[PDB]
C-alpha cells in the first residue's frame, strides 16, 4: 500500500509489453445500453480511450486496459455487433491475435477481443499512475 | 433331450449358446453371399478347397446382358473427387429410366478411401466446414453403429468397416430402387423337406446315424440377385 508498487508495478503490468501476449486486463462492452441513441462511428470512437467503470474490485476506474472485448447479446442484431468490429478496425483498433483470448461471459458465445492502440492507452495510463502516486505521497 | 418344454435352468443357456453360434456362422455365410453378389456380380459358389463352382457361380452381367459402369478417382490429383462422382451420378440416373424411385446415392467404400477422399483440398472445406450430422437420413435412421456418412452433392459416402472391401474399391449404387436386389431361400436336402416352403436356416439333430457321437446338422440354401446391374458403378481409388 501507499504506492508500494500498487500503482508502480500494477500500471507497469497494465501497459507492459507481455500483457498483450498474456490475458488479463479486459474490458467488456456488452449491448443494450451501449447502443441506445448512438451511431456506429460514435460508438467506435467512444470505445477508444474508454476508461474502466464501476464493479471493478481491482482498480475501479483503473485507466484504459489494453484489451476491449465486444460480444453479442440478445438485444443486439448481428449488424450492430459486426458493425463495431469493422468500424473500430478502420480507426486502428486491431484485434487480438490469440484465439484463446476470444471469450465472452461464458454464455453469449460470439465475443471478439480488440486490442487498443499504444498511444490511446500507455500515455494516459502513465499520467494517471503518476498523478495517483503523487496524491498518495501527499498524505 | 428336447428340454424346450421343461426348460428350467440350463436349457435357456446351453441352447441359447448353441443357436447363437449356429446362426452366427450362417450369418457369416449370408454376409459373404451378399458381399460377393454386390462386389463381384456372381453367386458365391465354392468347393472345399476354395475353387469356384462354375455351374453355380452365375455372373450377373451376363445373365441379364447389362454392364456395370466403371470409373477411377485419384485423390493425389487436383481434380475434385466429387466432380467425378457428380458426373457418374447422372450416368446411373439416366439408365434408371422412367421409374426412378431411388432413395439415396450410396457410394459405400473403405475407411482408407473415405479418409483419402474427404481429406482432398476441395472436399475438406465442406467436410470440416459443415458435416452437420444427425441430419443425414442414413445416420438418423441407423443411429446404432459406428460408420462415417458424408452426403455431399447428392453423393452419400458411407464408410464400410466390415473388412469385406479391398482398398481402392468404391461401389456407387442407388438405394431403395424396387426389385433391384433380391434374395431367395430354398428348402433342405431331405425327402420330407422337398416341395416345402423354405423355412430359413435349417437345423437337425442326428443321433442314430453313428454311435461315437450325436451330430447336429445345419443346412442353409441362399442366393442373392442383382437384376438391374446396370446401375452399380464400380470405382478405383489411388491414394
Amino acid at each position: 500500500q501507499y504506492n508500494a508498487d500498487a500503482y508502480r508495478r500494477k500500471i507497469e503490468s497494465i501497459n507492459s509489453d507481455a500483457a498483450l501476449t498474456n490475458g488479463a486486463f479486459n474490458q467488456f462492452a456488452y449491448g443494450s445500453q451501449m447502443f441506445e441513441g448512438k451511431t456506429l462511428q460514435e460508438i467506435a470512437e467512444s470505445l477508444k480511450t474508454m476508461q474502466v467503470k464501476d464493479s471493478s474490485r481491482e482498480d475501479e476506474n483503473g485507466l484504459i486496459f489494453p484489451h476491449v472485448t465486444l460480444q453479442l447479446v440478445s438485444p443486439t442484431t448481428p449488424a450492430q455487433y459486426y458493425g463495431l468490429i469493422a468500424e473500430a478496425v478502420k480507426l486502428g483498433f486491431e484485434v487480438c491475435p490469440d484465439w484463446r483470448l476470444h471469450v465472452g461471459t461464458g454464455r453469449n458465445f460470439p465475443a471478439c477481443r480488440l486490442v487498443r492502440q499504444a498511444e490511446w492507452y500507455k500515455p494516459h495510463n502513465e499520467k494517471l499512475m503518476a498523478e495517483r502516486i503523487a496524491e498518495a505521497e501527499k498524505q | 433331450q428336447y428340454g424346450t418344454e421343461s426348460q428350467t435352468a440350463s436349457v435357456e443357456a446351453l441352447v441359447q449358446r448353441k443357436i447363437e453360434h449356429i446362426q452366427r456362422s450362417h450369418g457369416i455365410y449370408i454376409r459373404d453371399c451378399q458381399y460377393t453378389a454386390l462386389l463381384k456380380d456372381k453367386i458365391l459358389a465354392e468347393d472345399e478347397d476354395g475353387n469356384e463352382i462354375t455351374a453355380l457361380a452365375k455372373n450377373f452381367s451376363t445373365l441379364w446382358g447389362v454392364s456395370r459402369k466403371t470409373g477411377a478417382i485419384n485423390t493425389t490429383t487436383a481434380v475434385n473427387p466429387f466432380s467425378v462422382l457428380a458426373t457418374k451420378r447422372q450416368e446411373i440416373i439416366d439408365s434408371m429410366g422412367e421409374n426412378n424411385g431411388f432413395t439415396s446415392m450410396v457410394v459405400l467404400c473403405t475407411t482408407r478411401d473415405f479418409n483419402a477422399i474427404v481429406d482432398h483440398p476441395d472436399v475438406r472445406a465442406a467436410y470440416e466446414g459443415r458435416d452437420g450430422g444427425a441430419e443425414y437420413l442414413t445416420r438418423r435412421l441407423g443411429d446404432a453403429v459406428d460408420f462415417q456418412v458424408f452426403t455431399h452433392k447428392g453423393v452419400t459416402l458411407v464408410e464400410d468397416t466390415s473388412g469385406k472391401l479391398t482398398d481402392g474399391s468404391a461401389y456407387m449404387f442407388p438405394l431403395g430402387v424396387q426389385d433391384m436386389f433380391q434374395a431367395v431361400y430354398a428348402p433342405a436336402d431331405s425327402t420330407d423337406h422337398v416341395n416345402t416352403i423354405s423355412q430359413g436356416s435349417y437345423l437337425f439333430l442326428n443321433a442314430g446315424e453313428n454311435w461315437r457321437r450325436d451330430v447336429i446338422e445345419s443346412e442353409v440354401s441362399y442366393a442373392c440377385m442383382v437384376t438391374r446391374s446396370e446401375l452399380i458403378c464400380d470405382l478405383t481409388i489411388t491414394v
Partner: protein
C-alpha cells in the same frame, strides 16, 4: 478364427456334408490363486450372525 464354423463353400445336393471342426487356436492357462484369508474373528458372532 475363420474356419471351424466356416460353412461357406457350396457343397453339392445329395452327399458330402462338411463336418467342420477342430484346427481352432486354444491355449489352456492356470488361473492364479490369491487368498485374503488374513483375519482373526474375536467374537463377530463367529460371523454366524
Amino acid at each position: 478364427e475363420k474356419g471351424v464354423t466356416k460353412m461357406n463353400a457350396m457343397a453339392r445336393g445329395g452327399s458330402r456334408k462338411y463336418i467342420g471342426s477342430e484346427k481352432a487356436r486354444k491355449e489352456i492357462i492356470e488361473v492364479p490363486f490369491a487368498p485374503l484369508d488374513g483375519v482373526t474373528v474375536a467374537s463377530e458372532v463367529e460371523a454366524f450372525r
